[PDB]
Design a protein around this ligand. Structure first.
Ligand SMILES: *[C@@H]1O[C@H](CO)[C@@H](O)[C@H](O)[C@H]1NC(C)=O
Ligand SMILES: *[C@@H]1O[C@H](CO)[C@@H](O)[C@H](O)[C@H]1NC(C)=O
Ligand SMILES: *[C@@H]1O[C@H](CO)[C@@H](O)[C@H](O)[C@H]1NC(C)=O
Ligand SMILES: *[C@@H]1O[C@H](CO)[C@@H](O)[C@H](O)[C@H]1NC(C)=O
Ligand SMILES: *[C@@H]1O[C@H](CO)[C@@H](O)[C@H](O)[C@H]1NC(C)=O
Ligand SMILES: *[C@@H]1O[C@H](CO)[C@@H](O)[C@H](O)[C@H]1NC(C)=O
Ligand SMILES: *[C@@H]1O[C@H](CO)[C@@H](O)[C@H](O)[C@H]1NC(C)=O
Ligand SMILES: *[C@@H]1O[C@H](CO)[C@@H](O)[C@H](O)[C@H]1NC(C)=O
Ligand SMILES: *[C@@H]1O[C@H](CO)[C@@H](O)[C@H](O)[C@H]1NC(C)=O
Ligand SMILES: *[C@@H]1O[C@H](CO)[C@@H](O)[C@H](O)[C@H]1NC(C)=O
Ligand SMILES: *[C@@H]1O[C@H](CO)[C@@H](O)[C@H](O)[C@H]1NC(C)=O
Ligand SMILES: *[C@@H]1O[C@H](CO)[C@@H](O)[C@H](O)[C@H]1NC(C)=O
Ligand SMILES: *[C@@H]1O[C@H](CO)[C@@H](O)[C@H](O)[C@H]1NC(C)=O
Ligand SMILES: *[C@@H]1O[C@H](CO)[C@@H](O)[C@H](O)[C@H]1NC(C)=O
Ligand SMILES: *[C@@H]1O[C@H](CO)[C@@H](O)[C@H](O)[C@H]1NC(C)=O
Ligand SMILES: *[C@@H]1O[C@H](CO)[C@@H](O)[C@H](O)[C@H]1NC(C)=O
Ligand SMILES: *[C@@H]1O[C@H](CO)[C@@H](O)[C@H](O)[C@H]1NC(C)=O
Ligand SMILES: *[C@@H]1O[C@H](CO)[C@@H](O)[C@H](O)[C@H]1NC(C)=O
Ligand SMILES: *[C@@H]1O[C@H](CO)[C@@H](O)[C@H](O)[C@H]1NC(C)=O
Ligand SMILES: *[C@@H]1O[C@H](CO)[C@@H](O)[C@H](O)[C@H]1NC(C)=O
Ligand SMILES: *[C@@H]1O[C@H](CO)[C@@H](O)[C@H](O)[C@H]1NC(C)=O
Ligand SMILES: *[C@H]1O[C@H](CO)[C@@H](O)[C@H](O)[C@H]1NC(C)=O
Ligand SMILES: *[C@H]1O[C@H](CO)[C@@H](O)[C@H](O)[C@H]1NC(C)=O
Ligand SMILES: *[C@H]1O[C@H](CO)[C@@H](O)[C@H](O)[C@H]1NC(C)=O
Ligand SMILES: *[C@H]1O[C@H](CO)[C@@H](O)[C@H](O)[C@H]1NC(C)=O
Ligand SMILES: *[C@H]1O[C@H](CO)[C@@H](O)[C@H](O)[C@H]1NC(C)=O
Ligand SMILES: *[C@H]1O[C@H](CO)[C@@H](O)[C@H](O)[C@H]1NC(C)=O
Ligand SMILES: *[C@H]1O[C@H](CO)[C@@H](O)[C@H](O)[C@H]1NC(C)=O
Ligand SMILES: *[C@H]1O[C@H](CO)[C@@H](O)[C@H](O)[C@H]1NC(C)=O
Ligand SMILES: *[C@H]1O[C@H](CO)[C@@H](O)[C@H](O)[C@H]1NC(C)=O
Ligand SMILES: [Ca+2]
Ligand SMILES: [Ca+2]
Ligand SMILES: [Ca+2]
Ligand SMILES: [Ca+2]
Ligand SMILES: [Ca+2]
Ligand SMILES: [Ca+2]
Ligand SMILES: [Ca+2]
Ligand SMILES: [Ca+2]
Lengths: 540, 540, 540
C-alpha cells in the first residue's frame, strides 16, 4: 500500500498539551458513522494514555512529555468500526520514534581510580587508565561522546606538569621528569569528562598515583673512621661493628649492605652483614700473633645487593686496629741428645749447662728451671740458672738403660708476670767402663762315677767390647782335688774335668777368670756326683 | 468458505493477562515473510488496544477484562502482507461475543411508591403496583429476572398481615380484614426484589398506603335530653340548638347531620341543620297559643346524608318544652244589634247591660269600659261594670239617623296586670213616636185677579205610618176673609180657593191640620196677588 | 487469505503488444492516492521489463513474446504505497506459468550410428540401437515424443527389406533372410524421427551396418589332378605343392586348409599346410625303394580348421606319382665259411667258384670281381667271372692261422652304367697234413761228474693228432759214446743217460725220433759237463 510514515517526536517536549500528531480517515464512511479508536503500549496498554484519538475526527495526539531514555519508540494499531458495530478497515500499524536530547550528564566508571609507576622511568611512559559514560545518543549526535582532561595534580611540586591524558581514550602518561619516591611518593590529580567532545557538560573524578622505588641512593656510614683493640690468641672474634644509612626502601635489596676489605694483609679478616640496621660486623679470620704488628689500616666499601640506577659515589670506611698482648710460655731450645758422658762421673759435675728462651719481648719476666721425668734420682738442676749437674752413682751396665740410652724430660716456668710451661726431652749417651768380670754358665753339675764326661761350662761378661775379649782360666785352692781346666776353640766355653777317680757327691771347685784381667774370682760351682759310667746323668 | 467461528469470551474475566484466543496462518507464506495485523473497534479503533496480534506468529489476544454491559460484542478485520509490501489474502472478518455474568444488582423503578384503599373493602382486593429492574441478561439466564416480596408493614397492628404481593408481577392485594381509617389510616411497608427469581441479590423499596374513608360511624348527640322555654305569639322563633359527634371525615356527607321529629303535634315545628358542628337547630313553625298546652315531649333522630356502610344504632334526642304566657286583650261578646228602643226614653235609663270577656285564665286582671264612636252625646257607661244607660233627648225623626239606624262603637281595656283593647260595634234600633204634625208644601202664592184658579197646596208629616194617615183641614181666624179648603181625592194635596173677589196683593191665610189629630197649627201661607184673569201667573 | 491464482500464458505469443493480464486494487485507498509498483526477475530484475504495472490503475501487462524453453515460469512481488510515502499492504506474491508450444524439431543423439551382424543369423535378431530428442514438453503433450522409422537401405539388393525398427524404442532387427558378407557386406540405411508420435516434424540420421563373416564357403583346388616324379633313396623330400581358394575371410580359420590322404599305402607320406596361399605341400615319409612300384594314385581332401556353417561339398584332389630309378651296388651272396680244403693244394686250383648278385633289373650292367683283405698273398680271382683259385704254398701249421682259421674279405664292383661295392667276408677251413716230426725240449745240459742223474728231455710235434701219436727214439752215430735212450710212461719225455764214466765237458749226442714214422732226424742236443757227484748242477 500507500502506508503511513513513522512519526518522529522530540524528547522532553514542552508547551501546551495536547499536540496533534496526525489525522486519519476511513473513506468507507459514506455509509454510516465511523468510530476511531487505537491500541497498544502507550495506548491502552502500559504506559496507558500517552496517546489517544478523537473517535469522531480521527486526530492523534501526544498527551504529555516523553524521555527516550525511558522508551525510545512506540508501535500502535488503529481501528475504525461502524455505528452498527462492524469493523470497516483492516487495522493499521503506527510508529513513533523518540529523538534524543542532551538531558544526560556523563559519569565516571568508578568513583576513584588508582595507579603506580617507578621513579626512574622515562618521559612518554603509559601509567593509568580512566573510564566514564553518557547515556544520551552517541551514534548520530555528540550528546554522548566524551573528551577527557586533567586540571589539578597535588604536590604541585617539583613542577606541576608531570602528566597528560589522551582526550579520546582517557589514558594517562608521564610527560615530564623528576620523579622521586624519596621526596614526593604519591600524586593526586583531578580529572574531568565532557559532553560533545569537551563541549557540553562536565564532571569530576580522582585518580591517585603511587611511585614505585628506585636505587636512587647509595649507602652512607655513620662513622667514617673507627678503632678497636684486640688480643693475639684464643681467637676468631668480633672486633667492631659499623653503622650506615641507605635511603631507598628498607626490606629491599636497595637497602641491604654488602662489604669487603680492600686489602687483606695475611687474609686474616672476615666481615659479614646483618639485617639489623645492616651494620658491618667485622671479625678475625685466623687469630693473630703479636709482637709482629700493632697497626692495621684497612678500608671497607659498601654496596647494595642490586646494581645502581645511576652513577653514584662508593663510600669507604677507614679503620684502625691495635693488638693487645698476651704473654706465652718459654721453651728450652732443643730436645737434647746431648751428653755422651761416661759412668765414672763424679757426683756433682757439670753435664749440660742449658738455656731456654721465652717469646714476649716485654721480657722482664724470668723463669725457674725444674726437672721432671724420671726413672731414678741422679741428676740435679740449679733452678735459677738451668744447670744440669750429675749427682749419684750411675752404671751403664744395667737396668733402665735399654738401647744404649737413658732419656729424661724436664720443665721450665714462665713467671715474672703470669704463667708457663716448657716440655723438653733429654737423651744422654751413657758410656762404657769395664766394671764386672767373667762368670760360669751352669753352677751345679751332675757328674757320673765310673767315667764322667767333660762338664761343659761357659763364660759371660756384663761389659761391652773390647772389655770381654778373651780369657785366662784359673783354679785356686783346689787346683788339685783334681780338676783340670779348659777352653773351647771358638772362645766362650770351658772344659771341666777331674784327674782323680773321686767320691760320692756334694763338693765344689773354686774358679777364677780374667778378661783385660780384672781377674775374677769366681767361685764355687759345686758338683753333685752319683753312681755311674760316663754320661752326665739326671741325679738322685 | 471454511470460515472461522465466533469467539465467546466471559465478562469480568481475571487472571494473568495476556490470553491467547486463537492463531491464524496465511499459507501463501512459502514465498516471503508475512506480516499479521488486525483492524476495527477494540483494535485500532476506539476502544483502542483491547485486542492485538503478534505480527509474526499469528496469535490473537485479549489484553484486559471486559464488561458486556459496556460493549457486548466486537467485530474485527485481520490482515497479512508480504515483506515486499503486498497483501496476500483478502482480509478476514472476526467476531467475539461477550457472555453475561451476574455483576448487576437490581433497582426499583421509583424511590418510593404510594397507594390508597378504602377501609370497608373485601379481602382479595388489588391495591398498588411496584416496579424494579436488573441490567444483566434475562433471556438466557436468571441474572436479570426478579422475584418480589414484603417484609415489614408498620402499625404491626391490628394484625401484621393485611397484604401480600405477587412475586412475579409485584402487585399488592388486601389479604386480611380489619381496616379502619378511624384508628390506623396509613401503612408503610418495606419491599424487596431479587436476582434469579428470589435467589441472587436483593434490594429495598418503600410503599405507603393511605386508607380512604367509610361510613363506619353513626352520629351521637351531646346532650340526650334538653329543655327550653317559649312564648305564645310574635312567633316563628329559635327554641334550642343541639350538639352531636359523628366520627368519619368532616367536610363529608358521612359527617353531615339530617334530622326530623318523630311526631309533629299540630305540625308546628321545623328543624334545620347547620355546617357549624352541624348542630340541630329547632324552631317554631306556626306560633303557639297557649293556655292550651304547656308540655311538649318530642324526639329527633339524626342520620347522615348518605346511607350506612353497616347496621348501626340510630340515636334520638328526647326534648321538653314549656310555653311562657303573654296576656291578651278582652272582647265584648258580640257586636250588638241590640236595643229596639223608643224615642221616649227617660234620660238615665237602662238600655244595654253588657259584658265583655278576656282570654287568659290567670284572670285576676280587670278592665274598664270606655265608650268611643260618635255622632253626638246621649248615652253613658259605668266603666267598672259596663252598663250602657241612655241620657239625653233622642228623636227618631231626624238627622244622623239614616236607615232606621244609629250605630255606635265602644271600647274596653285590659288592666290589672298589663294592656288591652276591645273594639265592638253597636247598632241600636230606634223607634217611632208621632212627634210632628202636617204642613203645607208651597208657602207663597201668586194668585190672579179676574178669576184665580185653585192654588194647589199639599201636606207632609215627619212621622212614620200610621201616624200620617189621613187629614182634617181647618181655617182659623180668617175662615172667611174668604178662603175655602179642600182635599185631593188621592189624599195628599189640598185645594185653596177664595169666595170673595178680593184685593191687590200681600196677605196671609191661617191654616190648621191634623193626622191622628195632633192638630197642627199651621199657619200663614201668605198670598201675593197681582192684576189678572184666571191662571196662576209670574208676579211683579 | 483469498489469494490470487497463477497466471497461465502461452509461448511465442503474438499480436499487438501490450497485453493486460490482470488488475489489482488496494482498498486502503480511501485515504490517499496509492502508487502501484512491482518487483522480481522479469520485472526490475534480469530479464528486466517483461512485465510492468500502471502505477495508477493497477493493471499488469506482458510487454513482449516469450519462450518457455528459455524461462518456463516467473514469480513476482507487488506493492502499493501512499503519496505521503508509506506502504499500505503487505506485498503480494505473483506467479506465471509458460505453456509449451511445438516450436522444437527433434535431433538425433549422434550424427551417425554404426552397427554389425553376422551373415548366417536368423530372422528376428536384434542388431543396432538409435537415439534422438525433442526439447518441447513430453509429459502433458506429444510436442516431445518421437516415433522412429526407416526409409532407405542402400544395396537395395538381394531384396530391400532386411530390417525394421521399433517405432517407440528405435531398436533395429533383422527381419528378412539372405545376408552374405561375400556379396554385400555393408548396408547404409536412412532413419527418421517424428513429433507427436510420428505426427509432427521429422528429421534424418544415418546408421551403417557391417556384416560379420560366416563359413559359407568350402575350399576349392586349383588343379584337380597333378603329377610329379620321384627318386628311390636319399629321402624324405618334397614331391609337389598344391593350390586352392576358399572364399571366406583370409587370416581366418574359415580360410586355413587342412589335408590328409585317403589311403597311405605303406604309410610313406606326409603332407603339411602353409600360410602362403595355404597350399598343400606333400612329401615322402620314409624314402621309397623301387623296382617294386612306379604308380601312386592317392587322393587328398581339404577342410577348414573350424566346421561348416552349412552342408557343403568336400573336394578332393587326385594325384599321380612316378618313381625314378637309382642303381645300387651288387653283393656276393653269402659271407662264406666255405672251403674245408687241405694244405696240399696245387698252386692254381679251384677253391671257390663264387657269384654275386645286383638289384636293379635294368640289369645290363656288369661288374668286376676284386679281392681285398689280406694277410699274405696266395689266392687269386678271375675278375670277370669271380673264380677263386688257390695259388701258393700254404701250411696249416703256422702263423696267421689262429683258431683253425684263415679269414679273408673280398670285393665286387657295379659298373656297366655307374658305381658299386660289395664287402664280403670269407672264412676257409684249412686242413691237416703231417708235415713236421718230433723234437727234444731242452737243447743244452749241464751234466755232472761222479754220478750224473738222468737228463730229462721231451718231445713236441707241430702236427695235429693222430699225427703225433707215440714214438720211437733212436741214437745215430754215437749210439755208443755211451748214451742210452728212454721214454716216460705217460708218453711225452725221454730219459737220457750215459753208460761210460766220460769226460770234462762240451760234446753232443745225435738224436732220432718218429711219430707215424716220419723219422726225425734230430740231432745234436749238446752236453756241457763240469766236476761233480750226481745232481744236474749250474755249471761254469
Ligand atoms: C595524593 O595523595 C596523597 C595521600 O592522601 C595526598 O597527601 C597528596 O596531597 C595527594 N596529591 C599529591 C600530588 O601527592
Ligand atoms: C676508636 O675505637 C673506639 C672503640 O671503642 C671507638 O669508640 C672510636 O670511635 C674509635 N675512633 C677513635 C678515634 O677512638
Ligand atoms: C644516614 O646518615 C646520614 C649521615 O648523618 C644522615 O644524614 C641521614 O639522615 C641518615 N639516614 C636517615 C634515614 O636518617
Ligand atoms: C687508624 O689508622 C689511621 C691511619 O694511620 C690513624 O690515623 C689512626 O690513629 C688509627 N687509629 C685511630 C684511633 O684512628
Ligand atoms: C727413655 O726414652 C724412652 C723413649 O720414650 C722411654 O720409653 C723411657 O722411659 C726413657 N727412659 C729410659 C730410662 O729409657
Ligand atoms: C706448666 O705446665 C705444667 C705441665 O707439666 C702444668 O702442670 C702447670 O700447671 C703449668 N704451670 C703454670 C705456672 O701454669
Ligand atoms: C709440656 O707441658 C704441657 C703441660 O702439661 C704438656 O701438655 C706437654 O705434653 C708437655 N710436653 C711438651 C713437649 O711440651
Ligand atoms: C406509614 O406512614 C406513616 C406516615 O409517616 C407512619 O407514621 C407509619 O409509621 C407508617 N406505617 C404504618 C403501618 O402506618
Ligand atoms: C333544660 O333547658 C335548658 C335551657 O337553657 C338547658 O340548659 C337544660 O340542659 C335542659 N335540661 C334540663 C334538665 O334543664
Ligand atoms: C362525640 O361525643 C361523644 C360523647 O362524649 C365522645 O365520646 C366523642 O369523643 C365525641 N367525638 C369527638 C370527635 O370528640
Ligand atoms: C321533658 O319531658 C320529659 C318527659 O316527661 C320530662 O321528664 C322532663 O321533665 C321535661 N323537661 C325537662 C326539664 O327535661
Ligand atoms: C252607623 O253605622 C254606619 C255604618 O258603618 C256608619 O256609617 C255611621 O256613621 C254610624 N252612625 C250613624 C248615626 O249612622
Ligand atoms: C287599646 O286600643 C286602643 C285602640 O283604640 C289604643 O288606642 C290603646 O293604645 C290601647 N290601650 C292600651 C292600654 O294599650
Ligand atoms: C279595636 O281597637 C284597635 C286598636 O286601635 C283597632 O285597631 C281596631 O280597629 C278596633 N276595632 C276592632 C273591631 O277591634
Ligand atoms: C553402406 O555403406 C557403404 C560404404 O560407403 C556404401 O558403399 C553402401 O552404398 C551403403 N549402403 C549399403 C546398403 O551398402
Ligand atoms: C604332372 O606333373 C607335373 C609336374 O611338373 C605337373 O606340371 C602336371 O600338371 C601334372 N599333370 C600332368 C597331366 O602332367
Ligand atoms: C578359387 O578358384 C576358383 C577356380 O577357378 C575360382 O573360380 C575362384 O575365383 C578362386 N578364388 C578367388 C578368390 O579368385
Ligand atoms: C595319375 O593317376 C591316374 C589314375 O590312373 C592316371 O590317369 C594318370 O595318368 C596318372 N598320372 C598323371 C600324369 O595324371
Ligand atoms: C680272420 O678273421 C679274424 C676275425 O675277424 C681276423 O681278426 C683275422 O685278421 C682274419 N685273418 C686271419 C689270418 O686270421
Ligand atoms: C666301392 O666301395 C669301395 C669300398 O672298399 C670304395 O672304396 C670304392 O670307392 C667304391 N667303388 C666305386 C666304383 O664307387
Ligand atoms: C663294403 O665296402 C664299403 C665301402 O667302403 C665299406 O664301407 C663296408 O664296410 C664294406 N663291408 C661290407 C660288409 O659291406
Ligand atoms: C664506586 O665503586 C663501586 C663498586 O665498589 C661502584 O659500583 C660505583 O659505581 C663507584 N662509583 C662511581 C662514581 O662510579
Ligand atoms: C720431649 O721432647 C722431645 C723432643 O726432643 C720429643 O721427641 C718427645 O716426644 C718429648 N717427650 C715428651 C714426653 O714430651
Ligand atoms: C739405639 O740406637 C739405635 C741406632 O741408632 C736406634 O735406632 C735405637 O732407637 C736406639 N735404641 C733402641 C732401643 O734401639
Ligand atoms: C335506626 O333508624 C335509622 C333511620 O332513622 C336506620 O337508618 C338505622 O339503620 C336504624 N338502626 C338499625 C340498627 O337498623
Ligand atoms: C265594630 O264591630 C262590628 C261587628 O258587629 C263590625 O261589623 C264593624 O265593622 C266594627 N266597626 C268598627 C269601626 O270596628
Ligand atoms: C236598614 O234596613 C235594611 C233592610 O234590612 C238594611 O238592608 C239596610 O242596611 C239598613 N240601612 C240602610 C241605610 O239601608
Ligand atoms: C565331405 O566330407 C567332409 C569331411 O571330409 C565333410 O565335412 C563334408 O560335410 C562332406 N560333404 C557333405 C556334403 O556332407
Ligand atoms: C665280412 O662279412 C661277414 C659276413 O659273413 C661279416 O661277419 C664280417 O663282419 C665282414 N667283415 C668285414 C670287415 O666286412
Ligand atoms: C674256432 O672254432 C671255435 C669252435 O667253433 C669257434 O668258436 C672259434 O671262434 C674259432 N676260432 C677261435 C680263435 O676260437
Ligand atoms: Ca629518588
Ligand atoms: Ca761399664
Ligand atoms: Ca452482567
Ligand atoms: Ca372504621
Ligand atoms: Ca217620632
Ligand atoms: Ca515449446
Ligand atoms: Ca555367404
Ligand atoms: Ca700240416
Amino acid at each position: 500500500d500507500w502506508v503511513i510514515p513513522p512519526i518522529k517526536v522530540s524528547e522532553n517536549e514542552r508547551g501546551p498539551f495536547p499536540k496533534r500528531l496526525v489525522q486519519i480517515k476511513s473513506n468507507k464512511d459514506r455509509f454510516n458513522k465511523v468510530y476511531y479508536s487505537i491500541t497498544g503500549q502507550g495506548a491502552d496498554n502500559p504506559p496507558q494514555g500517552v496517546f489517544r484519538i478523537e473517535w469522531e475526527t480521527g486526530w492523534m495526539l501526544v498527551t504529555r512529555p516523553l524521555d527516550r531514555e525511558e522508551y525510545d519508540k512506540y508501535v500502535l494499531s488503529s481501528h475504525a468500526v461502524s455505528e452498527n458495530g462492524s469493523p470497516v478497515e483492516e487495522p493499521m500499524e503506527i510508529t513513533i520514534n523518540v529523538i534524543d536530547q542532551n538531558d544526560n550528564r556523563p559519569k565516571f566508571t568508578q568513583d576513584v581510580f588508582r595507579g603506580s609507576v617507578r621513579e626512574g622511568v622515562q618521559p612518554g611512559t603509559q601509567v593509568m587508565a580512566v573510564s566514564a559514560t553518557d547515556e544520551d545518543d552517541n551514534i548520530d549526535s555528540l550528546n554522548g561522546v566524551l573528551s577527557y582532561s586533567i586540571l589539578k595534580q597535588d604536590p604541585e611540586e617539583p613542577i606541576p606538569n608531570l602528566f597528560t591524558i589522551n582526550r579520546e581514550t582517557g589514558v594517562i602518561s608521564l610527560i615530564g621528569t623528576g620523579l622521586d619516591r624519596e621526596k614526593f611518593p604519591e600524586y593526586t590529580l583531578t580529572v574531568q569528562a565532557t559532553d560533545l567532545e569537551g563541549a557540553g557538560l562536565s564532571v569530576e573524578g580522582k585518580a591517585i598515583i603511587q611511585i614505585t622505588d628506585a636505587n636512587d641512593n647509595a649507602p652512607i656510614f655513620d662513622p667514617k673512621t673507627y678503632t678497636a683493640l684486640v688480643p693475639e690468641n684464643e681467637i676468631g672474634f668480633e672486633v667492631q661493628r659499623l653503622s650506615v644509612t641507605d635511603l631507598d626502601m628498607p626490606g629491599t635489596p636497595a637497602w641491604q649492605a654488602v662489604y669487603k676489605i680492600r686489602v687483606n694483609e695475611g687474609g686474616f679478616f672476615n666481615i659479614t652483614t646483618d639485617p639489623e640496621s645492616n651494620q658491618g660486623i667485622l671479625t678475625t679470620a685466623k687469630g693473630l700473633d703479636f709482637e709482629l704488628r700493632k697497626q692495621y689500616v684497612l678500608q671497607i666499601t659498601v654496596e647494595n645487593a642490586e646494581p645502581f640506577s645511576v652513577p653514584l659515589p662508593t663510600s669507604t670506611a677507614t679503620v684502625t686496629v691495635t693488638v693487645e698482648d698476651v704473654n706465652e710460655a718459654p721453651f728450652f731450645v732443643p730436645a737434647v741428645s746431648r751428653v755422651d758422658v761416661s759412668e765414672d762421673l763424679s757426683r756433682g759435675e757439670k753435664i749440660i749447662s742449658l738455656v731456654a728462651q721465652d717469646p714476649d719481648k716485654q721480657q722482664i719476666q724470668k723463669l725457674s728451671y725444674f726437672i721432671g721425668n724420671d726413672p731414678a734420682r741422679w741428676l740435679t738442676v740449679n733452678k735459677d740458672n738451668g744447670i744440669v749437674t750429675g749427682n749419684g752413682n750411675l752404671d751403664r751396665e744395667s737396668e733402665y738403660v735399654k738401647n744404649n740410652t737413658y732419656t729424661v724430660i724436664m720443665l721450665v716456668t714462665d713467671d715474672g708476670v703470669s704463667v708457663g710451661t716448657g716440655t723438653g726431652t733429654l737423651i744422654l749417651h751413657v758410656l762404657d767402663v769395664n766394671d764386672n768380670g767373667p762368670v760360669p754358665s751352669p753352677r751345679v753339675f751332675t757328674m757320673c762315677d765310673q767315667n764322667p764326661e767333660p762338664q761343659v761350662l761357659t763364660i759371660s761378661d756384663a761389659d761391652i767390647p773390647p772389655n770381654t775379649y778373651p780369657y785366662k782360666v784359673s783354679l785356686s785352692h783346689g787346683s788339685d782335688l783334681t780338676w783340670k781346666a779348659e777352653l773351647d776353640s771358638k772362645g766362650t766355653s770351658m772344659l771341666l774335668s777331674p784327674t782323680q777317680q773321686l767320691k760320692k757327691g756334694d763338693y765344689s771347685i773354686y774358679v777364677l777368670l780374667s778378661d783385660a784381667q780384672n781377674n775374677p774370682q769366681l767361685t764355687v760351682v759345686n758338683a753333685t756326683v752319683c753312681s755311674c759310667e760316663g754320661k752326665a746323668i739326671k741325679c738322685q
